[PDB]
Amino acid sequence: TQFEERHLKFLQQLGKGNFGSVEMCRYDPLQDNTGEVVAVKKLQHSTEEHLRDFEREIEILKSLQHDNIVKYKGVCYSAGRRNLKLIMEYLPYGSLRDYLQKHKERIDHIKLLQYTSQICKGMEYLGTKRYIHRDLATRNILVENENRVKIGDFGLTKVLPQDKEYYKVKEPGESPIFWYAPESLTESKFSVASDVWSFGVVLYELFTYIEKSKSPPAEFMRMIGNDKQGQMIVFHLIELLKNNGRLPRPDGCPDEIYMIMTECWNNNVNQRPSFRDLALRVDQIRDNM
């Protein structure tokens, strides 16, 4: 079934980035304001390269059906082929980052692990399709309700080549470097293993309860020196990672959860755990607790 542009009523801006913008809209064909509230993504500056990447993100999202992956709803073509709109489910609790920042320690360790398990499961399913998320962070995870989180924003997702286990980005855009694996920093190489490294960073964010002074950019900047600027930050971060500088164990975090983070943060790509293993391990910790 099709979505008519004339029936998409603007409600609120949700955000912007990666050459796109996301708005909360009511899909109201009955024109009585009883329509479903949806999330609508469109391109801000729509070049032929941007259209091509947007179409690929649409195909990727439409191919994914999992409880812990944001639902594709459709496409609106009313403005023509060159001005597509991606329609997705709207998750009113917003990002896990905002949700956790608000609700802090009132969300216990058992609950953080329920979210951790769901993130692993969504990521494992993503990996079976040979898709590399490339932007795993609490800011890119949505809360559906108290018991369910879902991976969102597939705007940076790459499909692995048929004959290779990594995707090489020739001309990188804005990069979340404090979530990046060393091979992604040095060679712009992305794989299931680099998504596992970013997952270790997600687990860290969770157990610091999004405390501002404890964030991966704040911790890494203190380790390299706050006087470092521009490309010198990347140069120093690479050398720090090479010499085993890592994020600290968050205050009150169980030893066992810190060990999972440190295994994800292995410089050897082949030694990092698998998402299938992580979900099994995290479910065992949950059960024990």
Ligand SMILES: CC(C)(Nc1nc(-c2c[nH]c3ncc(Cl)cc23)ncc1F)C(=O)NCC(F)(F)F
């Ligand atoms: C608005 C913003 C910067 N970007 C996007 N949101 C949604 C999106 C899809 N459904 C949503 N429902 C609620 C909210 Cl707050 C956002 C969305 N889908 C794609 C995006 F690029 C965002 O919130 N990102 C967090 C993420 F969704 F990725 F987890």
